[PDB]
Amino acid sequence: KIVNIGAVLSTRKHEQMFREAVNQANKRHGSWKIQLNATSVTHKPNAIQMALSVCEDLISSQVYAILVSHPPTPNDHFTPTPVSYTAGFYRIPVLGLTTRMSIYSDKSIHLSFLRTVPPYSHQSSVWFEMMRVYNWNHIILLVSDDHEGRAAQKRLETLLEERESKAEKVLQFDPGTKNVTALLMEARDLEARVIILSASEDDAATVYRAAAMLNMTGSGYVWLVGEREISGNALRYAPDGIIGLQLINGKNESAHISDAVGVVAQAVHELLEKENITDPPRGTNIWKTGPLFKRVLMSSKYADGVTGRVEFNEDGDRKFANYSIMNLQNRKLVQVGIYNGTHVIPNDRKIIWPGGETEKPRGYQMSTRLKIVTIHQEPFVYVKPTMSDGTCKEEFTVNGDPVKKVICTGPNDTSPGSPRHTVPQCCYGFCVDLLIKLARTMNFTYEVHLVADGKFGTQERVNNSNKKEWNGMMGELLSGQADMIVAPLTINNERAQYIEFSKPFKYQGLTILVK
Amino acid sequence: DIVMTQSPSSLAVTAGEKVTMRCKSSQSLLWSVNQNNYLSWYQQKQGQPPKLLIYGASIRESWVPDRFTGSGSGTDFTLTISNVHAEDLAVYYCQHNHGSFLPYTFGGGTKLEI
């Protein structure tokens, strides 16, 4: 007739609050003979002895649930994990309260862990809603944390699956390095201007400082971050015009503990309605109703709590979390909008962009300049080295028509032959005439270069990694270094599956060359 | 630090008269984008925390009677009392509130005597 509940807490005030909530749990549940005894454990700087003592005390206690409520740990590791693993050794449900890392979202390893604060991946859905509001498609996502970057980008891909659009650029690396300006300049050259960052305080500060250094914070740049990027020294270097996200009651442990204890009480009373009552042993036999009790918990529905409608998903996370929106207006946090469980409502306050007007800057750009690529075609593209220095001999045809050439840069020989020999040469012929006619027709410049090797391009998986990859003209076009391939390309389904074509200018087939 | 110049340093008047106190900042407290002056007038009486009197160099607080009148813009500002009362006797300070012009600084102050 007794149910034990374990928890890890340091502050005596919260321990008394937990005891009071435990006492009140039996108030409106009638005069049933169910008894609730409260037990909590304190903090120790280490983790091996902490985990050992916690496991021993909880085994001797035969608890049903475990609560951890340490947001401000001096160690930045945020590791209540060993308690969750030891609880999963007997399939004992664990409900997190503070940490929002997506590592706990993985039930394949965290077999007996839940939490009521959604991870930052929901901020990806919030940003998708923002994109719906402001009609933005191409983004430039930069991530540093590989543990969640894959998960965050997976969430973004799932969101875009409705739109069937793509993030124009993604970036991932080892946090700690600082020579990131090359990738920043790579992103700056593109057309999209909406930049979304997701990292810790150090990397957020580093990228804000670099963007200010390279003047990536001018007009038209719309930024978008979460909560961790506008905290600590990252807030000190924060460039004005940024928009940030705020979690409602993020650290209000007083109400969070009350909501958790109420949920626990109602869930325990729901379980006691059914048969097959099992209790943990004193730690090689698992608790047989572990998954059964977790299934009982999954279907739980509540109408109580200051936060509101508390409900769990298949991942045991929180649903319909209301979010606050903050704008860095002259280095002061001004609320500019609110977020419902499914809709965003801006408040009466105005939002100022890093540049001028308060209207949304269209995050798109155009570039007449087009990097053209091709291969050395014997009758269509004639390649000639310069005469003396960067000059093309202005030879004429036999029909009074001057020969029009183009200054082309490419390797001299193959890699085994030429280690590194790339010189500006003179290119002309048939394709050059076609492209020059095109440039005459529509106003846009170009910059011709050559393919590093002599292949059209094949999809070859890595020799050992077996990672399919293209090369040649297709490889240089897929990599983004090429904007338009103008070459005697063979129209076929395999290549049309990856890129687009215009109507054919040529009609011919294949033959056999003999002597 | 923006130098806040307050004039006069002190004054004594009879009840019912009208007084004028000026505030001059070394730099323009007006931000062009929003056209607002980052100046705040305060009333500080003996033994009490200072009470916010006028902000934005023109807007009175809800508790501030209409007799107080703050004027001036840019670098020069003025606090004016149309009908001076004995209760108004205090030392009044003007302080800038421009976040881009940190740190916050105060003027020399004006002592009101009756």
Place this chain on the structure above:
Amino acid sequence: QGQMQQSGAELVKPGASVKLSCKTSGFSFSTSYINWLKQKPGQSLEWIAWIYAGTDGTSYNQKFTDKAQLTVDTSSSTAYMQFSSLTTDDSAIYYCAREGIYYGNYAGFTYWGQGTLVT
């Protein structure tokens, strides 16, 4: 109406450290800004630092950047200022005040503590 209550008077040996507390109530503790000011007797108040409770953003005076540290407790809505390496120059009255912001625009310090004298 909001209330800010400070700690009692302290007698600290020179070179030692003191940590002052400032309990706040009657308003949104998380979405406001609190400032610590140093006021010597017969002297005007000297701004020390400000901190935002919602983001833990901290900014100190250069004279006190290496001398004062600020912390907050969301459960208690109480501000903290720890003054270390105390010298006789620190014999003064320290005050905690809540910023008044109207229409998103700062309008001055509208709320005050009772004051604390450190000897």
Place this chain on the structure above:
Amino acid sequence: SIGIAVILVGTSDEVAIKDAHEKDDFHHLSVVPRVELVAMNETDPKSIITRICDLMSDRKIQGVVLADDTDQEAIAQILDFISAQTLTPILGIHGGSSMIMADKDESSMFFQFGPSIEQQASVMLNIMEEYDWYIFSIVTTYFPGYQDFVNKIRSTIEGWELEEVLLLDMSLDDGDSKIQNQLKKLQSPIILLYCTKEEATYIFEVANSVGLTGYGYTWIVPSLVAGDTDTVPSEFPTGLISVSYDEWDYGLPARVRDGIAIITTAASDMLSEHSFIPEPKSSCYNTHEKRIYQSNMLNRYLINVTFEGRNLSFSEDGYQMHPKLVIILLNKERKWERVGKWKDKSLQMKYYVWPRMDHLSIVTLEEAPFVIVESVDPCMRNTVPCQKRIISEEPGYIKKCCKGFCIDI
């Protein structure tokens, strides 16, 4: 004079291992390793913690070897934490200390004796290549190592024809009707499964309820489904195929000798190439300060070991590089037979034709335009395999490729 710890839990020939402990030739390097053997029980993880604490505090243990006889993956799962939190590496060779979990920690130093998921997938596809069965289906549960297996098989097979892939979540109860309904999608004669033992029994119950395992359907399962040959679960269908680690010709003393030798040679490599051997103060209490002398290179010398013919190198994840594998089959009586061997990407089958649980044999001869016979590809499309018996011993056959005008008819 390195300290090596040997822990045995369960019935085992401890005297034989002790006699065979000094069966290595380590006289060519000044190592003189010290090996202490201690018996333990499967009482609790905390008892193991206390035992290893006492051992490392007393004998200054620089290496731990665990061998057991249970069928629980939790042994290595928790041993990973000890290996990561202690500078002394740990090795598992047999029993519960053999099944490979998801992954090891970055600071982990624990390695196991066995093949990876992808290597097992390759061997299973080699088996399907040996006997021409090219239609199959894959079903698995939410054990963590499912995505690796699925992606490995998909990449390897990218005329193979896969037509059904199933994922079952057995955490939810009362889903037996749903499982029975969704197992109706299976149409290939061969179905592949990746689950746990009790889950396998439940799935076999569902299959016998739907009757999809009688004669025309055969199942092949990984090593973890079987685990122990001595015990046969209630309703494993006759003809079950699986691949298991060769534990018959590779006994416990061999595993112990290999572990001791690899530890000794890794220590010698670390103390010779870098001239320093990391052997810090083996303090059980307050291990945080004992991790100062982080090796960072012994692991680099723990993944390349040769033992005079035996390439005992390990992989980055923690698994071995060149395992030895055997194949088992469930005959009518509940036992596992030894059918074939796989080693170094070579498949060897004792039966030239797989016995079954109309059909008529055809005899023919090669004729120049009508029946053309050629050797297999070091058979392609539009050809038919053909068996040629060789008479010198046991009946030998060699597979060729036969085609021609008559074959087309």
Place this chain on the structure above:
Amino acid sequence: LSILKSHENGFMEDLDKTWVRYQE
């Protein structure tokens, strides 16, 4: 659209005269 407008008129013929139609 530009490719079509070139194919409909005789600019491609001039290109042929320059390189493809030419003989020896």
